[PDB]
């Protein structure tokens, strides 16, 4: 009947099919997928969530370096030696899931707690003759980054752009009008259009396809806004190139059944109005944060910048998170930056961390397709007039 | 085609059917309706909006007292003698509309810029055994007032309550759950339900049925939230009585073609969690405020408290604005308080002013009906189970 | 061995001998402060949950003090039973360990208090326009202003004569010697040197103060603000008066016995004379108030006073003031406490009233080994005995 | 009659004799500051709209100074033409009243400036560790700290010897006599009394200062900060040095003639020595900068300087410092201004640089009737002439 009663039933039967190892290697299959790790974390949510700030899935971190061992990352405010912790507080090293699928449990010091100057940043902020990924999109109050030139799959098949919802939508005013570079009250700019569809919170069952936690009120922070280009807008100013990266391919969907090496540990790049071109590493997926109001919130992609340099700054929200080319293939996008420190090494200090929204799932919810070539763009314009 | 092009056409033809009095009494018909005053104000919006903070329609105010002369109230920050004003600044005394309908122009000093203790306030805040109009409804952050026990007209015909949207809906979190008296993080309370439909901004053409201004971006601040009662909620705790007023009748719709005496100048009463029972006078309708972002905003009902006492305080939002009985008839509701001073007399200081939303139009937009007797309530419960 | 192990033993014994009970024997009804404190101590856990604090006294119904012995439970918002969870709703009666039973009253209440200016002849006199120093006089260190509570003499030792005030005003341990002046310190204005603090109390454990375990917390401390300032050698005792201005000549300290009828303290009219509000009257509403912080420590305050006719009993700066019972049969009024270094809602018609906190004078005088001087002859005699 | 009616006449005449023009005669290109200022004055309205301010100088292209005479127009955000309204986009060339034409350059620019500490031997010396007082020395009133600009002598009257600094630092008209000390005022630290301000300039009208109508505003004023502090009678002149520490011996003031080639000022390297940043170098980027407030008044600043190698030319406290041209052919370096009591974006690669404001020294010296002393012999001679 109710979604809560359905979720309680699913976890009820997982407990009902259960049985209880003297230091022997786990007999069950080791996790090799994101779904495997997420299922184990869901079953053991309560005592993972206790004495913890959040949880995520990925590979174990040892001495600041990413291993190849699938793991549930448990985030703590202060990581101390086991000798100073109570036996209840010390988290396990291995967790056994419902169907025998097992994984490791890593502990990472973590907290949920500037404008860079380059030729690119100048171009993205209004000096370039073209609008594209990275361009500063602004409403009358907030500044953000254009993520992708998109077209609607159904209906009018309208051509527009995708960015983060918080930057585009402020539901304290009637229309949400977007301009580049600045809105009329703050500076020069051209009217791009208004937000027509937006997503803020999606339930985990619809987003991931599985129950990612025990909380009846569990929502994914799926920030996303589609702005159809205005009728008077000139599409010849639009480019499908990601400046600083080049021509990109189509969205790479995050399949929960694929090997973790396909996402976790992969190098990613982003181009935004505030920090320009940065590179980073995907460190975790499906981060869980529990507020004081009883709601469990999920963020898809967790990225840490490379070489102890921040991956994003305030204003890079909406930027496209693009996988780097491994085999000469065109780099493919996997996420957008959502609207934050972790301590990896003892020698150095805390590094910054950023959040991303799964692009494939966001594009599905908003029923949007990414335009990756100029030929496709002009074709999509013609299809819109149709 | 576009709504702006339709609005521009309507005002274009009104200008096209035009012609130009030596102090002779206006030959046209004097306004006798809200629509008449609103049409004249719409035609002359520009130079009424210039050298002004806002405009509204009602009766002229002379020496602090309400006259019987239909008028367009022009609100100014400082009212000075004509000798100290430039000829362009001095507003006219009479304005002639498109079809010869004429009205007067009144000038009122105005600005858009506490908990009372009584037995009633205590009952409304959680000491009474019943929930009804006036009861403190609270989300996890904002406190407000329950306006009316309502039932949906169509669909499931669900029974719930009406309050102001801003108090119930905060679109920074997934669900908007309402409790009485307090939410779980701040104190004891019972779960009432969650918001299922809400209205924030309606265009003037849909709300009023006419173009109330020349601005292409013109919206009515029609704050409203319907919260269907939870399945587990006990309806025997619900009362249809307005404590401090008694049994009330059905909504009195504000017809724009009725004589102005039916609304302007009428005594109204409200019962809220913060100020309790207060009385006031309806002073104006369809107040226009122009922001710095180019959007024209409209508020329906303007109320000033009687005897220089405030009509509302922060927290009375959602309260039902009820007309007082003139002929022994049950008092009938006309509005809800929306989520502020005017100088009427020289002897005393500035009085406070409050805003109301047209209940008939809000009930139509949300497709809701007010329940005014316990028999009707239990009948509506049975119809919901149906 | 440890006090915690002794306290844990005491409550473990009470649980072991407990025989649970419907309607319960009348005549086993509490008639003492100790009776109410023992019941509250046993049921500390279930009372401390969903509550800001507890105290013992008389049940309050419709804002008026009844004669029914009760444990007052203080809540941030008092709501109707229908909006409460069954676990949240408090009992109306609680049976103690030995079958002694009492009532459980609920009061809306807040701790939002750290401690304005009232203008009268007394306030002016207390602040430095009187030719005499006594109870109510402004005592000032270099930073904080307070009120002189009582002219006192030490029981043992040199038997020195000085005055009593609150310790948080007198002692600021960030510097070595705490010097008091009247009216003002030399950095802010004119004044004479009264002396320096020689002994002070801040926290006493409940087993020492009350003589019983008032709670289950291994860390339970009574906020017993108290400071003795022996008068300086050069100080002129002829400037000192033992009269409480606004009340007159006072009797000796009235000790608060826990076995006496609650009538003797709860509900009694009290008066105070302080530098900030002058003469005010109030009513003792509760005894032994428990507050649980976020750091796990339980704190106790002795006397709770609410001003009469919806007027505040004290203001910031009145700390140190003597809380004095009113005369009932013409007897000289007798002091029972000092104001410690705060709102409750009693009536639905009116708004929240302020509450103030008092320290048990008899127990503070015992810990500090001080005696109150109530007549000028006793003063001069004590000055001579100090020289002896 | 009125200055406004005279100014309105001047521009009414220029419009009446104006013969509008495609490509326009080269050789009628501006070659002077006056030429650029006259074109900007005529076109003030269309330039002041959509702009934060204007100045005259050389066009800037790709962050480098060109040799093309231009009116620099300062904008909060410089965007590509495609995101601009046709009315918003500025011209590339503007023809003046008499056919004299110039270019129109756009620069990102902000007025976010009211005026840190740099550590060096010079700064220490200027702040009170040197045995001599001169240009760069910290001059202090009881509230504000500044920089001694130049040792000066009055041309007429008693011909008294004193020093020149900025008036906002020297004069605070909320009290009668403005006393200067070095290094510090008596309320804050040690120091010797230098003297009190006897004459000061704050606002001069543009017709008096420049000799022309620099704008169409009836209310147009040049921010001409300047204060003369005659040395006290008791002051010891042997402590005064005419050397600019960090530069050496300087020549006499180089006047800024509006009819001279822009090469003579725009783009020239300048140096300054102040109490806060010490010795810094910069480049003169523009002259006669116009700022329009919200109260309807147009204000003008003479010299605009940007520091070299992306380092700030000045800091708060450097006001009063002498802006000194660098030597080109071994000649003694000559002063051209003083720093008035501020960011621009030149390059896309790097970030916003700071800009500072200077007052025309030759015109400030004229209004205040002062002459600069550039050698110790001239100093002592002037001391004797004052006694005469
Ligand atoms: N609740 C907790 N809060 C803080 N620290 C904890 C907690 N539980 C365990 N720890 C600490 O975390 C350690 C485990 O760290 P982790 O699982 O990351 O180890 P690792 O990957 O083998 O090595 P490395 O420490 O290099 O990452 C425990 O030994 C203990 O010191
Ligand atoms: N733009 C304006 N700003 C301020 N004051 C104005 C403006 N235009 C007109 N007024 C003032 O308002 C006056 C008109 O006031 P109004 O129309 O309310 O008069 P009334 O109703 O006859 O009398 P009363 O002043 O008693 O209300 C003018 O005479 C003038 O002094
Ligand atoms: N945990 C709680 N938090 C808030 N309110 C509570 C709580 N438990 C009980 N109450 C409220 O307090 C009421 C009991 O109040 P109380 O003990 O003061 O009664 P009383 O002395 O008979 O009457 P009066 O309300 O007139 O003082 C309950 O009926 C309920 O409405
Ligand atoms: N009102 C305005 N606000 C902001 N930017 C403007 C405005 N008017 C013009 N611009 C921008 O300034 C440009 C002209 O800049 P400018 O005069 O400095 O050119 P330049 O000297 O040839 O080159 P550079 O940009 O390298 O300095 C226009 O093409 C347009 O992009």
XYZ file of C-alpha atoms in Angstrom, chain B residues 77 109 178 180 187 280 328:
7
model
C 6.052 57.791 1.059
C 0.884 58.209 3.140
C 2.179 20.185 9.260
C -0.351 21.185 15.806
C 7.808 20.535 20.852
C -10.822 45.942 11.395
C -28.197 38.763 12.461
